Amino acid sequence: RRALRLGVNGLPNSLEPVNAISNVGPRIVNQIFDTLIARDFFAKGAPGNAIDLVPALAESWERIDEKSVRFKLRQKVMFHDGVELTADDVAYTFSSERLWGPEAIKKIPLGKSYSLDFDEPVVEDKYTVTLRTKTPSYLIETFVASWMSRIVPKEYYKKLGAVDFGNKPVGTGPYKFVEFVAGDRVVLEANDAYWGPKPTASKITYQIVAEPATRVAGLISGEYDIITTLTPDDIQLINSYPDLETRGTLIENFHMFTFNMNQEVFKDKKLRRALALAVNRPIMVEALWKKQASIPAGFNFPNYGETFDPKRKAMEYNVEEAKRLVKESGYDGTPITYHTMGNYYANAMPALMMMIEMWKQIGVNVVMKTYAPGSFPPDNQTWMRNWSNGQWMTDAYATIVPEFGPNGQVQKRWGWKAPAEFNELCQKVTVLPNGKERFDAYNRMRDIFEEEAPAVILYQPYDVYAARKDVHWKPVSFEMMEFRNNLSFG
Numbered sequence: 001r002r003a004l005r006l007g008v009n010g011l012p013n014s015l016e017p018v019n020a021i022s023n024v025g026p027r028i029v030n031q032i033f034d035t036l037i038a039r040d041f042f043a044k045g046a047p048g049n050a051i052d053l054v055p056a057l058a059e060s061w062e063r064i065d066e067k068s069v070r071f072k073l074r075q076k077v078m079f080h081d082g083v084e085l086t087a088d089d090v091a092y093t094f095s096s097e098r099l100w101g102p103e104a105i106k107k108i109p110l111g112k113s114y115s116l117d118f119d120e121p122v123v124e125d126k127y128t129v130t131l132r133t134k135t136p137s138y139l140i141e142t143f144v145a146s147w148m149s150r151i152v153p154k155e156y157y158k159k160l161g162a163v164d165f166g167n168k169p170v171g172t173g174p175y176k177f178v179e180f181v182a183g184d185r186v187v188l189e190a191n192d193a194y195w196g197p198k199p200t201a202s203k204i205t206y207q208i209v210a211e212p213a214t215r216v217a218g219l220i221s222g223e224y225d226i227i228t229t230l231t232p233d234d235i236q237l238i239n240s241y242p243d244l245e246t247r248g249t250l251i252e253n254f255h256m257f258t259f260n261m262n263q264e265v266f267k268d269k270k271l272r273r274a275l276a277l278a279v280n281r282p283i284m285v286e287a288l289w290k291k292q293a294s295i296p297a298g299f300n301f302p303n304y305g306e307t308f309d310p311k312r313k314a315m316e317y318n319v320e321e322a323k324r325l326v327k328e329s330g331y332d333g334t335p336i337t338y339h340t341m342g343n344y345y346a347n348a349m350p351a352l353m354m355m356i357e358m359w360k361q362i363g364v365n366v367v368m369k370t371y372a373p374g375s376f377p378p379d380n381q382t383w384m385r386n387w388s389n390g391q392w393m394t395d396a397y398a399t400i401v402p403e404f405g406p407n408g409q410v411q412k413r414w415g416w417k418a419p420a421e422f423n424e425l426c427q428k429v430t431v432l433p434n435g436k437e438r439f440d441a442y443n444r445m446r447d448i449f450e451e452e453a454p455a456v457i458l459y460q461p462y463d464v465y466a467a468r469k470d471v472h473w474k475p476v477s478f479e480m481m482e483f484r485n486n487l488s489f490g
């Protein structure tokens with residue numbers, strides 16, 4: 001088998017699966033670990049966007065009541081060190097101690113904020129485990145299929161601790177750990193004892209190449225087989241090669257810009273809203289994304305299923321209202337910084353440069369502050385910054401509630417003083433089954449989000465990869481790379 005070499009835009013700081021949640025972690029952690037329930041993005045000839053859920057580490061599952069799901073596990077599954085997977089490892093993965101309890105915050109900072117209102121799991125036998133919530137939750141199934149739910153080995157994890165585990169991970173996945181050189185590379189090797197489809201590459205290397213031009217040059221020179229995070233602008237040039245091609249797809253994620261609302265200038269919604277109203281998204285999508293990116297109608301996406309609102313109007317663009325809001329605000333003309341880690345996000349810098357011109361027309365001076373990986377300053381030295389959110393559930397709960405809710409980082413760390421009505425609705429949607437009340441509450445939350453502007457949604461990016469034609473691999477509609485039944489050579 002050939003070794004697979006990947007040129008990437010970044011690497012996570014840890015291989016602990018929850019801590020690795022980002023645009024750069026899942027493409028690695030998806031190889032090392034498995035979940036109880038998995039997604040088959042290729043079901044019924046779908047071009048990597050199928051919503052179909054399939055058994056993975058759990059052979060079957062059944063909802064027992066409004067707050068519990070019982071799982072029957074695959075038998076004789078081995079972690080990379082030969083230890084058999086049991087309900088003990090599954091219970092530990094979803095425990096108060098490791099994930100959501102008070103004693104877990106130090107090791108997994110976002111564990112509690114991203115988790116459901118869990119109750120301690122119940123081990124029925126070696127291969128049977130019930131995952132449950134303290135209050136009703138119809139989200140257990142989607143949570144278990146998500147990036148929050150990769151299964152860790154209890155004994156090995158406890159022995160090492162979360163920090164050391166993140167540097168030497170052990171999972172049940174098709175590829176096993178070889179090396180992790182901080183801010184440089186990750187090397188994995190084929191796990192030939194894998195329970196599912198046998199790995200088709202002998203090794204996988206993820207090498208950071210921060211500059212996209214240098215990344216493209218690496219593919220051309222033959223240093224990489226696949227490269228990530230390109231722009232629709234690179235398409236014509238790569239495709240002009242007989243042996244190279246681009247492969248892209250819209251992903252279930254949105255790019256945005258956000259604010260440090262602890263800062264005096266951003267304490268009030270007025271300037272935040274003015275900045276949002278001046279963003280001409282169609283011109284950015286046309287010029288930088290070649291119409292391949294999509295602009296959502298608010299914090300509202302098709303993957304939400306029953307909680308997606310297809311009748312929702314597009315987000316308002318109003319330069320004249322933006323001009324009035326700036327005039328009425330306390331803003332003087334002082335430059336406002338916008339922090340960006342080069343092009344960690346595809347089109348981060350060209351998008352920002354277009355927005356700086358748009359904002360100059362409304363009387364707001366915004367200045368780009370580009371920083372290197374590991375150079376993100378303390379919070380009080382930041383004003384505006386870019387971000388993204390992967391829409392990780394088949395429900396509107398994610399990411400409006402875990403990120404922007406009362407228990408989330410936007411309110412707790414970034415100082416968004418959310419209206420009381422918003423937090424009340426966040427609590428309601430957590431416990432309610434689908435219906436008119438729940439559907440209407442998400443719409444009211446979307447209206448408040450647009451009015452308050454704690455963040456400004458830009459678009460769903462069109463994720464662009466480039467590969468050698470002799471490397472058969474299709475992208476999926478999520479911020480990760482899938483190699484199961486989706487990687488072959490020659």
Ligand SMILES: O=C(O[C@H]1[C@H](OP(=O)(O)O[C@@H]2[C@@H](O)[C@@H](O)CO[C@H]2O)[C@@H](CO)O[C@@]1(CO)O[C@H]1O[C@H](CO)[C@H](O)[C@@H](O)[C@H]1O)c1ccccc1
Binds near residue numbers: 013373374376
């Ligand atoms: O830029 C990355 O993370 C990004 C991550 O944002 P992503 O858009 O990639 O991932 C989001 C998630 O945050 C979550 O909302 C779910 O959906 C996902 O798409 C996030 C957490 O790792 O912090 C970020 C924000 O720009 O970064 C910010 O916070 C870190 C602080 O330790 C960085 O080191 C800083 O440089 C700084 O830029 C990153 C780069 C290298 C190592 C680790 C993370």
